[PDB]
Each structure stands twice: as C-alpha cells, then as structure tokens.
Design a protein around this nucleic acid. Sequence first.
RNA 1: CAGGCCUUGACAUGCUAGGGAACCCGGGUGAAAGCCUGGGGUGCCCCGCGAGGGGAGCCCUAGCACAGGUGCUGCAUGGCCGUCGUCAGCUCGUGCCGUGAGGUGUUGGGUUAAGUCCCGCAACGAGCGCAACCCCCGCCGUUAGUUGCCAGCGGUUCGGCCGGGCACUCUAACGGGACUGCCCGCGAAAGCGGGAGGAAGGAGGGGACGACGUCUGGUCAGCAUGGCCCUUACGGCCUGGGCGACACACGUGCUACAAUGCCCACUACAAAGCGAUGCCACCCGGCAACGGGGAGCUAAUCGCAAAAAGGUGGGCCCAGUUCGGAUUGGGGUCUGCAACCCGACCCCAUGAAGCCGGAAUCGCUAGUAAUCGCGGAUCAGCCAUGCCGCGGUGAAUACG
Lengths: 60, 127, 24, 112, 206, 98
Amino acid sequence: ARKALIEKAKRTPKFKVRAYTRCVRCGRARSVYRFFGLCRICLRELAHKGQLPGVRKASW
Amino acid sequence: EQYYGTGRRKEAVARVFLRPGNGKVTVNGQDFNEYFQGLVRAVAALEPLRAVDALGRFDAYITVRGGGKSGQIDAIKLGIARALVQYNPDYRAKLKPLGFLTRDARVVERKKYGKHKARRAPQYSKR
Amino acid sequence: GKGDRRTRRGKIWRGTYGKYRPRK
Amino acid sequence: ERPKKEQVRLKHELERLQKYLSGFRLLKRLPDAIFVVDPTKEAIAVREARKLFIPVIALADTDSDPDLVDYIIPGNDDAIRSIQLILSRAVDLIIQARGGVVEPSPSYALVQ
Amino acid sequence: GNKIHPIGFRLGITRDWESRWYAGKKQYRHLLLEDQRIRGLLEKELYSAGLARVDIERAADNVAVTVHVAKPGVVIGRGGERIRVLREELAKLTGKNVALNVQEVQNPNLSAPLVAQRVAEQIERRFAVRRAIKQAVQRVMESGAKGAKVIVSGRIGGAEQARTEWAAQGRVPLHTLRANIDYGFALARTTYGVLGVKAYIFLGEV
Amino acid sequence: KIRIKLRGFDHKTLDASAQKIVEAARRSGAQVSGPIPLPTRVRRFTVIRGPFKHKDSREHFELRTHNRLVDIINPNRKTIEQLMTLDLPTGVEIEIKT
RNA sequence: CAGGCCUUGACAUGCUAGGGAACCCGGGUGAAAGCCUGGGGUGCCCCGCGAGGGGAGCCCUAGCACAGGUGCUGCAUGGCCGUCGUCAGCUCGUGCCGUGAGGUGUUGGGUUAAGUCCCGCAACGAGCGCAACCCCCGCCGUUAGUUGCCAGCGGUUCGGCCGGGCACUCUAACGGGACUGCCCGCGAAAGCGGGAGGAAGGAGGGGACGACGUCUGGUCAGCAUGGCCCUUACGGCCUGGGCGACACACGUGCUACAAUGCCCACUACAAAGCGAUGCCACCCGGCAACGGGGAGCUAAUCGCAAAAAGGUGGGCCCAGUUCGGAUUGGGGUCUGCAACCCGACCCCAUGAAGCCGGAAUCGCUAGUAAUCGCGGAUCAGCCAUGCCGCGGUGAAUACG
Ligand SMILES: [Mg+2]
Ligand SMILES: [Mg+2]
Ligand SMILES: [Zn+2]
C-alpha cells in the first residue's frame, strides 16, 4: 500500500490540512527535508556522492 | 596619551584604554564599580595594575562587548595587562613571571551526538 | 517552580506568555 | 623541500642502509665462492652458500667442524695476529693474478 | 560493515562536486529534482557507451550536462545524429537551453565506476567471480595505477551461502585525503539475486 | 553608487571572480571598494547514519553560503560595458542595486 | 479495524475498435467514496466555393498484454548502520626451520597514545591499520572594508545620529608558528625527566577518519532485489474508529519536596541559527492567550529578541506552606473542512503525592561535572520534558 499513496500525496484535490510532504526519490514520508525534498537516507546518500551542490561533510 | 590593550577571552572582547590621571575606570559608559556591582570577582581584574603599583596613574576607559558579565572580566584582565606591557618594555616581569599573558584557551567544547552535554552520556539501563 | 504555569519561571521554561509574564 | 620529518628519516634510512651494506654492494651477482673467518660463527652464511653450491673457503679452528668446508684454512680465529696473516697473503695472492704487487695492508694501529 | 563513503569523505579536497552550481533556498529542490531526473535517463540510454560521470554547472537557465564516457562513439552517433536527439530529450523535460559537452576517458581501466561496471557485467554473464575480480584488478595496474582494490558482495556462483570476495594490490590508503582514489559502484541483476561491486583505484599521492 | 552582491557556495571560485571585478572596474573609471567579506551563512542538517534504528553515532553535513560584496563608486558608461557583458559565473550568483 | 464503493484498476507502457475525441461550467443521491445525469464546442495534417470527409497527438468507452502488494523469508541478498573499539592490531612476497597442520617476520631488550621508533635477531621487504595530509579554537600578521569607534579636530536635534575615518572590533581569504633545531641529566640508539624562550612544546586542546574481521547482529517497513504467496482481491478510494485503550511491571526523562529558597517591581552580560501570503517592529482593543490596523526585511543594515542564573531592595520565617503543580470544575483564544474521542496555549478556582528516597544503580578527570537560558531542524498546529547545535556561572578528586 505504498504506490497509490506516493501519488495520493502529490494530489492536492483535498483540504490543505492533508497536504503533507514525501521524499522525492523514495516514498519516505518521515524525516523529510523541505529544502532538499529528500529524506534522511537519500540526503546522506546524495551528499556522499556530491550530487548535492555545496553540500559538504561537517568538521568543526 | 592613550594606552590600549587587546582584551579577549571565551567569546568575550574588551577594549581597554589608559589615560594618565586620577584612578577612575569606565566600562560601556558606566562606572567600573557600578557595572560590576555585586561581583566579588570584579576587583580581581585590576590585579596586574597592583603588581606594576600604577593603579592611580591610569584612568582606564574600557568598552567590553560580548561573553558574560564574568567572561568579560577575564578578557579585561588580559587587556589591563597587555595594555601596560606595550608602553613599557621593563614591565615584562609581571606578564610572564606572574603569568598574566594568555587568552586562556579554556573554551567550551562541542556537544557530541549521543552525549547530552558534550561528555555527560545518557542513563545506562542494561536491564 | 518551573512547572507552575502561574509564575515568572513557569512561563519562561514553557516558552509562552500570560498575565504572569507579559511582553514588557 | 621535504619537511624536517623526511630529512631525519630518509637520512637515517641511508645511514643504516649503508651501515650494513657498505660491502654488500660490489657485485650484483652470486659470488663464485666465499671466504670466511670462524665458519661456526657465520655458519648461517656457510649454509646459504652450501645450499647454493657456492664453493666455500674459510679459516676455521678446532671450534669449527671441517667436513662442511670446501677449502679449509686451519688456524687461530680470534687473536688478530693469525687473522691478518691469512687475510693478507690471501688478498695478496688475489691481486697477484691481476698485477700490482704491493706492500702489506693497514693492520697495526693498536695491534697489541 | 562501516567505512564512510570515500567519495563523500574526500569531497573537501580531491574530488570536486559532481554537480557544481548554486541556488538560493527558494529554488534548489527543483534544480535538485532536475539534475537528478536528468541523470536518470543519461544513465539509461547511454550506459551502452558507459558513462563514469555527469558534471552539471549553472548560472541562469543554462545547463552543462557534460557527459564523460570511455566510448563516445555511441554518444555522438554516426556523424552527429545521436547527440542531436539527446539535446532534444534533455530540453524535452527541462524548459531551459540545455547544452552538452563531452570528454573521453584517458583510461577506462583507470576509472573506477568503469571497472565497477566492467565487473558488474561479467557476473550477470556467469563468469568465474574469483577470476573476474583478480582480473579486473590486474587490468587496472598493468594500466598505470599505484593501487587497486575490488570487492564483491554475496552469492558468488549463486551460492545460498552469501560470501564476500576481496581482491587488492599495491596500496589503497583509504584513511588518507591525498589519496585521489577513484571509486564507483555497479550492481548486477543475476537470476540468483542481487550482487555488488566496489572499485578502489588509488591514483596519485599528493 | 552601484551595489553588486556575490552569493554562491564555493569560496575558491566565488573569491577569484570577485577579485576580477576589482581590477577591471578601476581600469574602467571610478574607484571600487575592494572585495569585502561579509559573514558566511551556514545551514547544518543532521541525519541518522543508520537506515533503520540507530539513534547514536549519526552523520551531519553543512552548506556554506559565502557572501562577498563589492562596490563601485561612480557609474560610468565605461564600466557598464565591461560588466554588463563580461558575465562569467561558473557556479556563482550576482545581484545589482543602487 | 468496522462500514460504503471501484475494477484496464490510484500510477507504466504496448496493441486493436464505431463513437467522442484537446477543455471549461454544473445537477440529482450520498457520511465521503462511488453510481446516474444536464450544458458551450476545438487553433491541427488536407482534397475542398462549401457542405463534408480522411487523420496525427490527447481524451473517453470496450477489450487485450499486464499494473499493484508496508503480503512472507534480513539465516536466500544488495545498500547502509550498530559493535568489540581509537582498541594495536591484521596479512601478503621471497628466503629460512618443519613429513605436515604451521612456524619465522609480528619473538626477544628498551621506548611510546600505537606493529611509535630505536637496538637486537634466518630473515628482508611490503600492504591494510597507527601517525601524517583536512576542518575548528588558539597567538600574530597581509589584503578587504556600510559591523565597528570623541579611537583623533570636528558639527550632533544630545541614539555611531550626521559629517568624517580603517586604528580598534569583527567579518573571511591567504600565510607565518612548534622542528626534539638550543642548555642541563641518562644511553649504543631510539628516548625520557628537568629548564629557558613562547599565545602554544614534546600528537597543544576538540573534530572528521574507525584495519582482516566478529556477532547466521539489524533492516524485504526507505529503497533496491532472488523465490514464495494474492488478484473483482493480501490491490485501491473514502467516512469513522484505531496506533492515546489500562489491575499492573520495567526503561529513559521532566518538575520537585524548599531559605545556597519560592514570589514581585526594576536593572545588566551571551552565542548560533533562523525567516515572503515568513520572522513582526510601533500602536489600540483585551487580566491574558490573542486579536484589529500598520513601518521595516530579498535580510553583518530591519524582525524572532526577552537571554536566564545573575545585580538592587521588598515581602514570606520553617509551616504539606507564598515550598510542590498533579487533578478537576467553569470561562475563553489560535491553526484547521474537523480539537467527542485525542492538540497546544490563557484566566479564575481546585491547590494531590511527595519533608531527599530499600536493595540495587548511572555519568564525568577541566571549561569537564552541575546549574541557567536561547536557536534550529521536523512542522498548519502540536501533546518536545525528546533530538541535534549554542553559550553564561563554574567545581570536587585521582594515594594506587
Ligand atoms: Mg608501521
Ligand atoms: Mg577521558
Ligand atoms: Zn530518500
């Protein structure tokens, strides 16, 4: 019961209350970042790759 | 005319000045003994000025900005010591012998993840 | 203490304002 | 260049390299034979040579077992006396098949 | 298993971002969902040439879409017809003016995401994994390299017992930053499950 | 008179291309208050390394937005041709106000 | 989970067929979903005065191949993480001893945070680890100045506000610094102890980095994926319920049982981030939540903003209390179609247990522990006392 939902989330024909987020690459609704449009997993994944502009490993 | 010292310590920054004269001391446009009123630590800052003997020879004007009401006092004690080492080369025998010269690297460390407060780890169950 | 809503600290810790901690 | 680290290092490295290989350069080929003082001392060596069929000459005494030496020099192996007397006239008979007959070699400097 | 991504770890030094532009908060998620969806079809219809990088640079409505390939004789086509329909497929979804440069490969044996795919394939073809690894390493070194390390996951020969094949030579300092160690990961979709291939081509020190 | 912002990410490129517009603006007339560095805007987000359930030893990265301002003092018709056409930002941004 | 519905299916693509085809606005019934039903009429490719007719996209109906599954197996797997463990370790090459498993190196002496290094030695090298390269605070400098300052003469409506200025401060880019190179003491060396100089020595203090491997560890529920299992349903829509149920028990945490204190008025000092139907200055309405207007910000230039503890003097006087805020009644406000389940905030009144905690047990060696306040992310709102960051005050002790 994941496929129908990934599209049901884009679809905003119903109240803006129910209009939550959803990771772009994978159908992950949790730990979604408004900025990247990914979840915690993918974020870390792309950042390790470099496909994340100016997104670098922290070292302070 | 003016005698300047570079005060700084633990995210605090004091700009100290010294015009020969009375003995009064100012900090951020308010009397020294009035800004630091209730801190029994305050009068400790002017401690290098009591090992040099020249407190009433220098009207101190300081503008410290940042840190804490006490962290500022620590920075001030560097710029009260660093300011009278500049205009006096023989006054090096109180900034080294009576250690008055170091920014005190004693800074707050980073809080590590899985360490409530950088080192204080959480509660241990085992059970 | 910091739990009694009706106080200056009970209003602070709970990050809200009221009769007992108005905006200046 | 090279930080003061690699200078102390690479130096030392050449130092010891040298320390042990001052004379083990020369020929980059398996010695046609080997001459040795106390064969029971550097028998390890003698073994190597022996396992390679490399002919072996050496100056052994009673401390040393004859059998396993191809060419045998029976005599003192400690007092610097006999050592020079057999090293000398051996390295002397060496060059006397190349030309250049000389006087004896440096030996006395504190020789007793 | 542990060991942080050698790519994400060098990112600071050595490896320059494989997508180097900017975007204020307002719009970044979209240039992100773009760059991403783009690599989605450039890695499909172009893998036959076998691409080992897709750099993408920007400024204001133009795109780099630079594709590095070891075999650009399928990227350009038969005179200029192929890439003609690839600047078409690009701007087809992207409402911008998408260019498209192309670099070659000064050694497909010295590119990791290349050797990682080079092995990935041999596995779906039922090759001796041991030999397919000891090989894809002995290929990188005979071809101008200081270090090579090739790692296969589980199910070698399809065995119900998932193993872990390990092959290296020379030096591969993964704890170093001056490592310039190329790396890339290819799969393999055999009938007996999934496989994995890690490629560790240590290049130049300093 | 004219203000020009330089936003972006990389401080090596955002630095070279903000020093170029410093020698080619003095050569085009009015003086130009050199490359000034204003505070860098960080954006650190923390993500749990484990894909599953491993609340501890996680991993977080940053996003360093390096600002850099440069001001030209007098609005020639000279500089207006050097700058309006010498647009060479590789992964950089530039605003212009007055 | 109960109930009410839909099957070329909520999403992919391919093929066949008269009709209509791009799209917009409705109506009836209903909890919604769904089912049924009433209305304008189309730029296209083109023989054509035109009617009209072929027709490519898309769309609608039928049918077909198939979609879909958070259904099972993490001992069938990928990927990725936890872990012993920042542990000093783990191996290969050739030679060498051994019938062989396998030794040797990597043992031995000394040293170190360490297979750190030196000296030894049938071994000599090398790899993965260690260290080093990378980032932060440090001490200082060059470049650059709209943050900053009677720092200097200056005018100043008496606020860096105006002129005016890069010295400060800072901001941020790049360099210098520390290396057992100087003196003493031990030794063959590695090296240690002691001292001067220095902002800083013997890795300077914190990060990022975690070896062959181990736990048939964890995850098919993020995803990927082998096989199995389901298909008018183990798929799919929706209304409501549920994950918040409660006689209990454990874990992690918050606030405390008080005078080193609680309460009120008034007065000071941080750092890091964050903000367009977003952070709200200043006003007025309200005890207040909040609400009517409304300046400013693309944000070192305005806003969140008040930092709190602390400083000043004032009331409680040891009292289940002005200690302690659960519980419950009544009245409200904001987001939202919707606060009964089951939201947080606000006001009045309820003012429960607890007067320091059995046995057991947890954390930390210095800006640490304790203690106080702030941001961020997620997010309409929020049951955040959580988590990741930040700083103000600042110890106790280490014989062994
Ligand atoms: Mg070593
Ligand atoms: Mg410790
Ligand atoms: Zn994802």
